[PDB]
Design a protein around this ligand. Structure first.
Ligand code: A1JCJ
Ligand code: A1JCJ
Ligand code: CL
Ligand code: ZN
Ligand code: ZN
Ligand code: ZN
Ligand code: ZN
Lengths: 229, 228
């Protein structure tokens, strides 16, 4: 089940994959959750997304030390919002190499985020350029197009049932997408469907703001987005 | 100004011309879109197609008559019809084409033909040189999301000119025309980033207004401020 560790929650999703969850109180609504991933790749660990804060992200590293006890080789962060990049300092303090879409790194200062140390770029078909994502092990990074934000990226976990949609995808029980002025409401639906088509064998869809769901999360999200066009 | 068919050309500098093409639309009437033609030694470089293949062919035929140098390459500045509607005409003329990778990704969704090559950008917005080989005086800058997620901009080295494409409107414009693909959170910062990337440019060229001073940048950013 869910393992509590400090103020975070960790859930094993597969033999080599865990979901990290961190919480932030907002005005009028407490304990807004955000999820990321932790992946064991042989003798190293890879992280997808920080927690909301530096202190919480340090607790992710502490949990990894206690439960996995392998070095964290790198982290990928999936766009320039606080839930995904708010804890970059904890990673850099620990010497962990960080990667984000070049556009996320360009947006980070405007958003009050610390940029990742390396930039990912993408082919016209959305797949990460290998020269920018060397030695990513099972992390298969895909840029699906603009949607939740212009910079949002997604990550398949090779060999598992799992694909991570980040904040682009919401579960099949969602009532809305959030989506604000930095959403692209013209392309959101196609971007959500492109994520599904990029990871056609994924049966467990992991998301930032919902618990894991089946592929219906992708379809339901796309159908909500269709109505915004 | 000179005419070739349905196209209008205006020389802006010794080696730079603006091309203007028109598409009839309900209510608006004829809608102008501007791009650039740059003479770089023994070759010509193009920024943006016209709205259609046939209008883009008219650009190329005017170049052959007026300049009579081969067109080496074209850069197109986002995946909307005014900027990429004529890709097939460029390709049929043997012209190598370049666009933001994201523009090429969006082009099929938009009913556009993708460029042959994709540009990618550093975290500071400047094009990665390995993706923009032999661009001569064209200095390509991604200012951030604004008019669209993929909009790019181009400065012309050796001149006072910077091209804002559809991101920038002139200092008399009343609104930005933003649709669902605009990023209204970042638009203002992206407009200002374009200005800061080309801080010495005194002639700002843009898609839907005649050339203006840097007041186009300031006014665009201030209009965008109000959408946040
Ligand atoms: O702050 C962000 C960045 S995606 N998201 C957010 C905020 C409040 C509630 C929820 Cl469900 C998501
Ligand atoms: O169609 C496009 C793509 S940016 N722009 C357009 C359309 C109508 C009027 C104006 Cl002034 C610009
Ligand atoms: Cl596993
Ligand atoms: Zn977000
Ligand atoms: Zn989020
Ligand atoms: Zn446009
Ligand atoms: Zn336009």
């Amino acid at each position: 089940g869910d393992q509590r560790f400090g103020d975070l929650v960790f859930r094993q999703l597969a033999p080599n994959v865990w979901q990290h969850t961190s919480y932030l109180d907002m005005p009028g609504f407490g304990a807004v959750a955000s999820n990321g991933l932790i992946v064991r790749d042989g003798g190293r660990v890879l992280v997808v997304d920080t927690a909301w804060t530096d202190d919480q992200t340090a607790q992710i590293l502490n949990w990894i030390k206690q439960e996995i006890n392998l070095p964290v080789a790198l982290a990928v962060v999936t766009h320039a919002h606080q839930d995904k990049m708010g804890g970059m300092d904890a990673l850099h303090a620990a010497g962990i190499a960080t990667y984000a879409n070049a556009l996320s790194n360009q947006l980070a200062p405007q958003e009050g985020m610390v940029a990742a140390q390396h930039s990912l770029t993408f082919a016209a078909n959305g797949w990460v350029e290998p020269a920018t994502a060397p030695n990513f092990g099972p992390l298969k990074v895909f840029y699906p197009g603009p949607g939740h934000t212009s910079d949002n990226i997604t990550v398949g976990i090779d060999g598992t049932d799992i694909a991570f949609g980040g904040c682009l995808i919401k579960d099949s029980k969602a009532k809305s997408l959030g989506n604000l002025g930095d959403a692209d409401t013209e392309h959101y639906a196609a971007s959500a469907r492109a994520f599904g088509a990029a990871f056609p064998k994924a049966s467990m869809i992991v998301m930032s703001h919902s618990a894991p769901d089946s592929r219906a999360a992708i379809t339901h999200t796309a159908r909500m987005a269709d109505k915004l066009r």
